[PDB]
């Protein structure tokens, strides 16, 4: 339920997470 964005190499995702 908790969406978290994350950047990676100037690439940011966005994973969620319950």
Same mark, same amino acid.
């Given at each position: =339920? !908790? /969406? @978290? $964005? !994350? #950047? +990676? +190499? =100037? !690439? /940011? @995702? $966005?994973? #969620? +997470? @319950?």
């Amino acid at each position: =339920g !908790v /969406c @978290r $964005a !994350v #950047c +990676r +190499r =100037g !690439v /940011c @995702r $966005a994973v #969620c +997470r @319950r």
